[PDB]
Design a protein around this ligand. Structure first.
Ligand code: ATP
Ligand code: ATP
Lengths: 283, 272, 298
């Protein structure tokens, strides 16, 4: 089933035709971005990042016994009432394996003393395995939850020891946590560390750290008001997007030599940019 | 749905036909209160309220149509009198705790007529309203209308207000009904407006609401001014719906939107 | 219960002042304070006009310099009351249908002061609600060692203004180094420690058991306010509010003031074994309120 052609055999002829059409679309990027989040206006970069998270990366394992990460995580920080929770809501709507929470999460080892068995009830992380775990109110988590989230991000496992029962449970998923800056106002003068109350390792493990600003643009305000009134008054359907996403995940691309050299050059340029003192970077 | 008699319906429509029906009904709720016309208009709109719309068709959460009103000011303006008149007619906000306000915010995450008092028991003109009441931005943003009731130190006004207070502590409801408008007629008007009047947004009213929101955002773009938020658009929609219900109109007019904006401006005391 | 002979013995006029003086005869002076304590013990009359619940419980707060026998009055009230619990600042449910004596009231916790606000406004504890129909008697001391008439009530005794305003009557007791008064007090204390009893007075002090019997008998009656007398209430309250707006420095004669006046008048008529509030009750309530007002002024 993991072979793409095997699922294509499971899929009907029309489904394969639609998949081929989606694969041959030149503007597939823009069409997917528009269809995935139709209601939200603007903020195309965040939509692109979320789409890339949904597609994901190719996992690898070293000969030394270690395992390489094949998932990416996105954290959204923005001013209040900037529709950041709407992103999580639409992601949960689209993804059947998404698990929405509001900051229990790991596991619950309840011993059935009748049978003397430690039956474990899966937490939010476990249920969201091999998918996306949307965690709103990321900055309101307790210290225990922060430790558990950092451990999940670092070792993609869940370790539990209740009533002298030590166990380790695998958990491989992407996190789309969202949180507000300290005080509700993003100070461009301060860096991300000062604006957001998060532990350093958790902040470091994240990628594609998107930041939202209200910007009070009058034209955008008119567009938003008109959109709200029209609500009071898609190139590809969700099923087609799901089929294409599964088909793409069944693929496994590999890096080429020219791409390798270009990656090295771009990394050199990025590190030179960061080392440059012309403008201080936020991280 | 009361079986409103045709004579009663005719009388209610004749009342609605009067151009002063908004002000007449605002005064009809305890006209013995010294002025406070805008506050009475807001309370009248709260009694009428907006139109209940179920937005499950759009997938989005259903929008609340109830209007939340906050009355702020020092004691001595007879707020308790008008509150009791409203309660009879229709059946500790100063001391709010931060844990309780957080619980209330969490509850609101899933019509309120509140009376506020200063922490110092006296209104400080040098201090802003938010500082004087000691309330958060999140909670204050969930009140559609916030009326600033100042207590002037005038001997004539204070004498009138005290006399009215002791009258309320002494006069029976029979004399109040005999002297003022009959309360049954006002109750029938309110029931008729809340039952049969279901105004709908027109294109002109829609454009007026959108332009009003744009103007509010422009006001918020200025330095030191409160930035407009999307909940303000919904508040304006609810106020326009209530005002349209006042005139028994089944369509929301631009006049309703302008009146809602004027009432919101007078409540917030933007000019000062 | 009681007998008709006791009814004749206590039915003589001015027995109000007699029972007032019979409370804690050892303490020298503080007659108006004793009258207020008697009113608190008897309490007002509950009413439900058109379903509007109107509680009759009376709350009295004693404030002023330390060592002026506050604890003596608190303990005597606690003992004489049929049901009461004595407690410090750092319970209320057990005090239901009784008197709750709270000494060192200024050293409480504002978290519990919110619940005290709830009880003083609702007589219930909402966690399921438990009845808390307890009249509260409180004693407080200044936080600077002495009371300063220059400073306000809140400054001298650090406590929220609203909670101070809730109390029906607020008493300020100041200790003054007057030679003659000190000499009389010294003679009184020496006599008490010598003869093991209070000095002789004009009226024989009442016994505790008879006092309890008569308090219960007065509690039996439930007088009501006639509307004819209410016109004089209008004149009195409008004059009081005019005086309040004359100088706004003190606490305003808000609606709570009028409600407390009504409760005090009803309680006074209750003690007189009458079913109708009269002019004398309003006069006495006004006298007590003005005495408390003058005590506050310094
Ligand atoms: N382009 C847009 N930007 C922002 N909001 C938009 C946009 N288009 C529509 N909206 C609407 O504006 C509102 C944004 O506020 P919303 O309640 O979604 O904020 P939020 O992210 O949940 O805030 P918070 O978590 O900080 O309380 C929503 O009703 C959303 O549908
Ligand atoms: N009329 C009176 N005036 C002043 N003192 C009196 C009087 N009668 C008795 N005393 C004496 O005053 C003292 C009362 O002390 P007590 O412990 O009651 O003070 P308190 O003011 O309640 O205390 P605090 O407020 O500091 O907690 C006793 O020594 C008592 O003999």
């Amino acid at each position: 089933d993991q072979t793409a052609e095997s699922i294509k055999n499971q899929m009907t002829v029309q489904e394969w035709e639609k998949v081929f059409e989606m694969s041959q679309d030149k503007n597939l990027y823009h069409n997917l971005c528009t269809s995935l989040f139709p209601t939200i206006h603007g903020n195309d970069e965040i939509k692109r990042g979320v789409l890339l998270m949904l597609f994901g990366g190719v996992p690898k394992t070293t000969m030394e016994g270690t395992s390489l990460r094949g998932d990416i995580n996105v954290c959204i920080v923005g001013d209040p009432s900037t529709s950041k929770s709407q992103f999580l809501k639409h992601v949960e709507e689209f993804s059947p394996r998404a698990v929405y929470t509001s900051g229990g999460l790991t596991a619950a080892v309840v011993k059935d003393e009748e049978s003397h068995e430690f039956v474990i009830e899966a937490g939010a992380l476990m249920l969201a395995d091999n998918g996306v775990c949307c965690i709103d109110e990321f900055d309101k988590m307790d210290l225990k939850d922060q430790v558990a989230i950092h451990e999940a991000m670092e070792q993609q496992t869940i370790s539990i020891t209740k009533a002298g029962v030590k166990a380790t449970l695998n958990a491989r998923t992407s996190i789309l946590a969202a949180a507000n800056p300290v005080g509700g106002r993003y100070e461009r003068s301060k860096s991300l560390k000062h604006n957001v109350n998060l532990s350093a390792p958790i902040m470091s493990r994240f990628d594609l750290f998107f930041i939202l600003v209200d910007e009070c643009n009058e034209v955008t305000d008119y567009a938003i008001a008109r959109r709200i009134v029209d609500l009071h008054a898609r190139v590809y359907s969700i099923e087609d997007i799901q089929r294409y996403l599964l088909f793409a995940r069944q693929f496994q691309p590999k890096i080429t030599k020219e791409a390798e050299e270009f990656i090295v050059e771009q990394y050199r340029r990025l590190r030179q940019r960061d080392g440059s003192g012309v403008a201080k970077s936020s991280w | 749905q009361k079986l409103f008699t045709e004579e009663r319906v005719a009388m209610l429509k004749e009342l609605a036909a009067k151009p002063d029906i908004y002000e007449r009904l605002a005064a009809a709720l305890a006209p013995s209160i010294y002025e406070h016309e805008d506050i009475k208009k807001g309370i009248l709109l709260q009694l009428f309220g907006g139109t209940r719309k179920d937005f499950s068709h759009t997938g989005r959460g259903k929008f609340r149509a109830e209007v939340n009103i906050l009355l702020c000011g020092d004691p001595g303006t007879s707020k308790s009198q008008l509150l009791q008149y409203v309660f009879n007619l229709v059946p500790e906000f100063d001391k709010m705790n931060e844990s309780t306000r957080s619980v209330l915010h969490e509850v609101m995450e899933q019509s309120v007529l509140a009376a506020a008092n200063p922490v110092e028991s006296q209104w400080n003109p040098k201090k802003t309203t938010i500082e004087n009441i000691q309330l958060p931005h999140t909670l204050l943003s969930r009140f559609d209308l916030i009326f600033l009731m100042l207590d002037p130190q005038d001997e004539a006004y204070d004498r009138r207000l005290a006399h009215h207070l002791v009258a309320l502590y002494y006069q029976s409801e029979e004399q109040m009904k005999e002297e003022h408008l009959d309360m049954a007629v006002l109750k029938d008007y309110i029931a008729y407006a809340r039952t049969y009047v279901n105004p709908r947004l027109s294109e002109e009213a829609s454009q007026a609401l959108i332009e009003a929101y744009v103007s509010m955002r422009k006001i918020g773009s200025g330095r030191g001014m409160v930035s407009a938020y999307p909940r303000q658009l919904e508040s304006l929609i609810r106020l326009s719906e209530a005002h349209a219900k006042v005139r028994f109109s089944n369509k929301v007019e631009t006049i309703d939107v302008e009146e809602a904006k004027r009432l919101h401006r007078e409540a917030l005391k933007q000019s000062a | 219960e009681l007998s008709e002979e006791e009814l004749r013995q206590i039915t003589e006029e001015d027995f109000y002042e007699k029972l007032a003086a019979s409370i804690a005869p050892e303490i020298y002076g503080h007659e108006d304070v004793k009258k207020a304590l008697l009113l608190l013990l008897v309490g007002g009359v509950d009413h439900s006009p058109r379903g509007m619940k109107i509680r009759g419980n009376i709350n009295v707060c004693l404030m002023g310099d330390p060592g002026v026998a506050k604890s003596q009055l608190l303990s005597y009230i606690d003992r004489l009351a049929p049901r009461s619990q004595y407690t410090t600042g750092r319970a209320l449910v057990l005090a239901d249908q009784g008197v709750c004596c709270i000494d060192e009231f200024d050293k409480m916790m504002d978290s519990d002061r919110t619940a005290i606000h709830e009880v003083m406004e609702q007589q219930t504890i909402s966690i399921t609600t438990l009845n808390a129909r307890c009249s509260i008697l409180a004693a407080a001391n200044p936080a600077y060692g002495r009371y300063n008439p220059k400073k306000t009530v809140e400054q001298n005794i650090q406590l929220p203004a609203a909670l101070l305003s809730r109390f029906d009557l607020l008493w300020l007791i100041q200790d003054k180094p007057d030679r003659d008064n000190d000499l009389r007090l010294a003679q009184h204390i020496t006599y008490v420690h010598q003869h093991s009893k209070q000095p002789p007075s004009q009226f024989q002090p009442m016994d505790m058991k008879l006092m309890r019997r008569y308090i219960t008998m007065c509690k039996s009656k439930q007088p009501a306010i006639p509307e004819s007398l209410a016109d004089y209430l209008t004149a009195a309250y409008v004059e009081m509010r005019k005086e309040a707006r004359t100088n706004k420095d003190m606490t305003f004669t808000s609606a709570r003031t009028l409600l407390s006046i009504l409760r005090l008048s009803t309680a006074l008529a209750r003690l007189r074994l009458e079913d109708v509030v009269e002019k004398e009750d309003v006069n006495e309530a006004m006298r007590l309120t003005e005495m408390s007002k003058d005590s506050l002024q310094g």
